[model samples]
Target: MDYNVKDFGALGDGVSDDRASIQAAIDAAYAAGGGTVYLPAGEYRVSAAGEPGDGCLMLKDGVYLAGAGMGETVIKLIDGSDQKITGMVRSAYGEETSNFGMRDLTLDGNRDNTSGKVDGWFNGYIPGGDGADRDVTIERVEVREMSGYGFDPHEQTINLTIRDSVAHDNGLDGFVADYLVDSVFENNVAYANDRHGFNVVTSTHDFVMTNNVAYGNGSSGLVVQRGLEDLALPSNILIDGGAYYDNAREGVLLKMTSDITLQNADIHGNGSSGVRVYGAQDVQILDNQIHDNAQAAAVPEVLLQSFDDTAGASGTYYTTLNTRIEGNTISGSANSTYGIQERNDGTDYSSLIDNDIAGVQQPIQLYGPHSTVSGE
Candidate 1:
């Protein structure tokens, strides 16, 4: 309702010529029907790309572009959303976007990483199989380094609401929710990423990932894939309360397909198998604290043999059918082959109940007879 940067013609004496005072205050706040264009702090050395000045800010439609907190106002390059742009956006340097909105901002792609190659906006796109829809709403933000993924969902960006953020390094797959359909990845803090900090592929259905906190990430803090889409199968997914640690691989890697529902979590060191359920089928791994993951600095060259089937450069080499690894608190190992693993096509059986696989040398190894299970 009220705005002043010289009444939608901002130029807070930071040496006028802020690309013609913020595009005449965003074309006079898009013809005065949208309000709030305040940058009341300081240092707004902008850089736009196809609209308002050289730092892009094309947001229209009943606007509420507010920012004067987070060391007092800072909005750099590439910004556009049909609506909403709440407080604090910083990147007195690098940031090149396609969209943004919702309260408490801080999208900083000020990446240096020892020089060259730092492109954000979900590099190398292949999102969605032709079903376009976008509805983003990120609250309480803080997106750092970001060279690739920090929230890369394509298909016109459908239904996203990243709450209370803190996405770090983000060089590859920090948060990539693909083929969206009813999303709500709640409470965030995805750290050091190079691969799979939180990657849900192709048919991302009704997901509401709760209380998040994924760690180091060289691979698998959380990785979910179900891409053999023949009309999509994975449904109603939910991963609650988290704390996945050091990862180089499997802290959680459920591939192929499923109807997942994971509860309370506190997974550990991870280089291999903390929770590796492949070829999903009615999965429901429950309850907290799965510990000490064969730590040789996170299972180097990890091979706690679950289903090698001629090892595919990672755990759970290949998979299929029913997975129900229940209740947690499992400790260190030396390739147990079956903390829970089965690579069969005949379908059914994949459980390890009230779990606490003690000395872990081989707690429950099964070769596949159709993969059967009880409450181990």
Candidate 2:
């Protein structure tokens, strides 16, 4: 059975408080042992449904939320709603939640009216609490203008697929994940965010990001890092077929992570390096067209660093081992310096193989000791 919000007394006039009516529809669908709660062609205004950290709507298991489409159906956050509201919709509080999703709708965070604080989707999948969110899908959605993040998942997930989605203009990262396994992200666009476009913080494995665009962010286009010391590092992460450019920082930043491969990427026109490897290991940059980077002076096309602070001053340095720069065209801008620059603890840790750096002034420069430029 389909439970419509309008049937449960929701006035989608963009002014009324539709929280209870929509919740009523969700409750009806959940009570029916799993059904679709449908919303059609209107802006449903809502405030915080629970506490300060809870979202405006709580999603339960076996209940799929559908809308008329992105522009046709909108869920707008009411003015004067709680600034700490986690998102427009979220998982039920600390429950065994799975098989639930939102599709074909626009979630307006109303950043100007509120204190500019919120994530679009606060995926509350807690680690080591209940089971992970499995077999979940989010598609054809536009999430933007939030102060915190766009698609933010806190803890663990498996078999998750997010495709054909757009996330832009968030205050922080456009999309974030931690402890993800066997997940796939396809054809997504994340641009003009305050921070990274795609950030995988810790403990992700066998993940695939295909044909995504990340450009003009305040920070890196994509970030994969071991953010917390206690959490396991990310591994087996593959980033393929992306156009990453015109950012304030690196096109791709890999830090304190391992087993990463970035292939067939068109990375260019950044303020800094095209790829920045910080204390990372077993990384491969392959088959990419990297050009016209270093729009900011003295920045390299690919930078390998272990500095804790400044690039060449006031910081501690570590070594990045088994880092491979292979089969890519690394071209520098007119004001650019080196195509590849390494500042590390040791030279034996990195290898540059079969790459074209003809457009750069200094093709390869290593400040560290004894590194092999093996594709000599």
Candidate 3:
């Protein structure tokens, strides 16, 4: 059944605080055991809602909030909203919450109208739970104009699928995901955010992102870091295909990770390396078109290094092991200084086979204990 927000007294007139009314639809649908809370094509304004502290409209289990379509249906924060407002929409119960989703809508955080340090446009938290073992899938959602992250799933979510979505024009990372397992991200686009286009940190494993695009961000297009956590580092990450371009930093940065594979990608025109692999293990850069990066400096397009002076890193040295660069084209731009460098302090093994290296004066520089460069 459909629980239309209009039926629950939501005046989607682009004015009038409709936070409670829209949330009423979700509560009613959740009480009815599982249903869709639908919204017609209009702007629904919201402010801080019940509990006074949770801030933002909450999403409950088994309730799916949907809209007419992107650019058609909109949910926005009110002009004088409380500074505590964290998101336009968020999971009600963290990891204990499942089978809840939002799609086909645009979320406007209204940062210009609001006050102070809003954390996320969508915040999902995991607070050590049990009794819920289901998945949440979101698609076709556009989130923008936030004081913080656009999509912040700050939980140990299992089997999360987000596809055909967009995140841009936020104060921080476009999409911030942490502690996710067995997830899939496909056909999404992130651009012009304050930080990395997509930042996945800490204990994310067995995840695959297919055919996504990230560009024109303040930092790396993609950043996978340990992120102040001692949890198992990001592992088994498969970036099957994507385009990472024109960011302020590396197209992709894999830091202190293991078993990561980036293949069949187009990575170029960034301020730093097309791909910066730091202190990772068992990384495979395969079958990709990585070129013309380091547009701001004279750095290598593809660098597997131990030390960095970027804003987020510690500038400490690290060592990589068992990295394979195969079947790829590592090209250079006029601003590029080098191509395909491995600076692991002469540790571990590197295999460079069947790669096309061009446009750089020095190509395929390797420093490792065991190195192999075969088939050009």
Candidate 4:
């Protein structure tokens, strides 16, 4: 069934209280065994009661929220208090409720009213449990102007995809997926966010990010970090295409991962290394244009380091092993330390072949061991 918010007594005038009517429409559609809750082209001022200290428009299983367009259909948060709203849209039960999708809408957190103190969407959390939200899709959505993150499908979400979305100027990371699986983030732009543009951390696997741009973020454009918990090793990730530039930190940082690939992308003019890898194995960095990174000082375009204490328990250290860096055009900033800094344990192996490096103090810095280097 198609339930329109207008039929449920929503004003959409941008001045009246539309939260009760909008959420009533959602609840009615969910009651009817899951249907489309449609919103026409209007500005909806969601009231403070709809926030309920957690979120507004709480999603249910199999319920889809459809809007006329991104800018045409806006949901403005209006919780008039110093305490921040938790999220604009959220699933209270997570994977216990699945098959929720949102398309063609803009969630304006109304940062002036809420003081940028809310998330756009907070989906799925793992509080030491075992189920996951599956088959969730968000397309053509704009989540911006908030104190917290833009989209957080965090902690044990599975089979989720976000495409053609813009997450900008949020207080935290633009898009963060922690402990997610089999997810795809494609054709999305995360710009000017306060934290990492895209952060996939803590046991996430089988993730693919393609044709996404990360620009002007406060931290790295992309960051993939480890969990350091038992059995929380992140792996099987791929980042292909797109650009990372003008970020405050490294364009990309991969730490304590395995079977990861970064290829066919433009990474340049960042504040730190274009790519930094630490204590990872079976990695492939191939066929990319990396240049003019680390503009602040003598930093390398690509730096690989292996050090002690990869895991903070029992003195577990790690070494860089079984890596291939091939066919990448790498250049350095003025007065750069090196084009490529390779520091590893003395017994590991890596193949660096057919790379083009130009205009640097040192093209390659091998401190611990020597593997293979050709085609400067």
Which window of ten consecutive residues has the lowest lDDT sum in model 1?
83-92
Report residue 291 deviation for candidate 4 (angstroms): 0.9
Top candidate on TM-score is 3
In model 4, what is the error at residue 67, expressed in angstroms? 1.4
Ranking by TM-score: 3, 2, 4, 1
The sequence of per-residue lDDT tens digits that candidate 4 reaches over residues 238-315 is: 999989888999898887778899999999989989998877888889998999998865788988877567347426
Error of 4 at 156 (Å): 1.5
lDDT per residue (tens digit) for residues 20-100 in model 1 = 565455446656765555556654433333321222344433333455544345443222221111111211121222233
TM-score of 4: 0.92
Candidate 2, residue 252: the lDDT equals 91
Model 4 stretches with alpha carbons more than 4 Å out? 47-53, 115-117, 227-231, 307-315, 344-347
Residue 210 displacement (Å), model 1: 26
Which model is ahead, 1 or 2, in terms of lDDT? Answer: 2
Q: What is the per-residue lDDT of model 3 for residues 199-239, given as tens digits with 9 covering 90 to 100? A: 98977888888998999999999988877745567899999
C-alpha TM-score for every candidate = 0.35, 0.93, 0.93, 0.92
Question: In model 2, where is the ten-residue run with the lowest total lDDT?
Answer: 309-318
lDDT of each: 0.56, 0.81, 0.82, 0.82
| Candidate 3, number of clashes | 0
